[PDB]
Amino acid sequence: HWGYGKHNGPEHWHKDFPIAKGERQSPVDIDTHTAKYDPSLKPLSVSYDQATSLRILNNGHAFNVEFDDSQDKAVLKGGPLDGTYRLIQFHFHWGSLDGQGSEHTVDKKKYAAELHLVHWNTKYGDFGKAVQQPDGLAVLGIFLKVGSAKPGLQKVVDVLDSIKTKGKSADFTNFDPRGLLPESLDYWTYPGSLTTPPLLECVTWIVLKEPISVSSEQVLKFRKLNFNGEGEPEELMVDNWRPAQPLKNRQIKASF
Ligand SMILES: COC[C@H](NC(C)=O)C(=O)NCc1ccccc1
Numbered sequence: 001h002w003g004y005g006k007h008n009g010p011e012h013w014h015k016d017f018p019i020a021k022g023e024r025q026s027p028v029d030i031d032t033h034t035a036k037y038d039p040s041l042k043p044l045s046v047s048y049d050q051a052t053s054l055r056i057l058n059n060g061h062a063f064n065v066e067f068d069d070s071q072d073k074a075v076l077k078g079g080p081l082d083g084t085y086r087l088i089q090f091h092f093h094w095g096s097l098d099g100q101g102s103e104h105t106v107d108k109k110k111y112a113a114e115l116h117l118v119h120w121n122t123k124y125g126d127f128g129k130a131v132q133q134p135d136g137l138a139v140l141g142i143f144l145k146v147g148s149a150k151p152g153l154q155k156v157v158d159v160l161d162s163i164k165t166k167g168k169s170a171d172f173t174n175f176d177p178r179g180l181l182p183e184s185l186d187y188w189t190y191p192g193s194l195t196t197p198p199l200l201e202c203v204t205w206i207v208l209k210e211p212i213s214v215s216s217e218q219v220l221k222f223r224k225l226n227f228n229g230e231g232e233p234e235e236l237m238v239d240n241w242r243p244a245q246p247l248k249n250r251q252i253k254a255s256f
């Protein structure tokens with residue numbers, strides 16, 4: 001089954017998921033000199049004050065912080081988006097070393113990690129129908145660099161002990177994702193896909209320019225996580241990132 005290793009990694013995904021060679025695949029390199037400032041972009045609106053987190057799951061490829069999306073609380077609108085997209089989960093992609101980890105790159109620069117807060121277009125009723133639509137999803141991408149600790153990430157850090165192997169989950173209520181946002185909402189945007197199989201080409205990507213700083217000790221604990229399930233030999237959850245894919249004539253816009 002799909003993973004990030006030699007025998008099942010991103011170079012193999014196309015066999016089960018043909019769309020891997022598709023026309024709007026993600027992530028991509030953000031060539032900052034070719035992206036164009038777009039005057040028609042409305043200001044971004046990230047409203048996470050009412051967010052209702054439920055749990056945290058090791059799914060054998062990343063961990064998911066999942067939210068109650070049965071009502072219009074944590075919502076993303078504005079920017080390149082039409083209408084409202086509700087927050088369903090977030091997860092990270094991260095490296096084995098600080099020089100790699102992010103999925104999107106900026107002028108070929110890799111960050112230590114990347115956070116994706118995943119949202120679905122509420123005109124489609126739920127997530128399931130949302131991923132059958134070219135505008136079904138909006139993902140806010142945020143870079144991580146190793147630096148000063150990020151106070152609003154330590155509560156996820158602290159819980160990782162409890163979900164070390166594939167298929168474990170713990171309760172994770174009252175988590176405030178506002179604690180993960182850099183100061184500036186300047187971003188690049190382009191149409192793309194999810195970066196894990198099934199790689200569905202349903203995503204409006206909104207990639208923040210300003211990275212968050214996280215401490216080495218915080219990112220170390222990410223890398224103590226396991227891809228294997230309990231009582232299987234240890235494979236560290238590291239390098240769970242897909243590399244940049246062909247742009248194929250899509251245009252990246254800057255909000256700034
Ligand atoms: C990770 O592939 C699934 C898909 N991924 C996204 C949205 O980033 C998703 O909607 N996941 C959320 C979810 C998971 C299990 C049950 C119900 C909802």
Ligand SMILES: [Hg+2]
Pocket residue numbers: 059060061062
């Ligand atoms: Hg998985």
Ligand SMILES: [Hg+2]
Pocket residue numbers: 131132133134135136200201202203
């Ligand atoms: Hg789609």
Ligand SMILES: [Zn+2]
Pocket residue numbers: 091092093116195
């Ligand atoms: Zn992701």
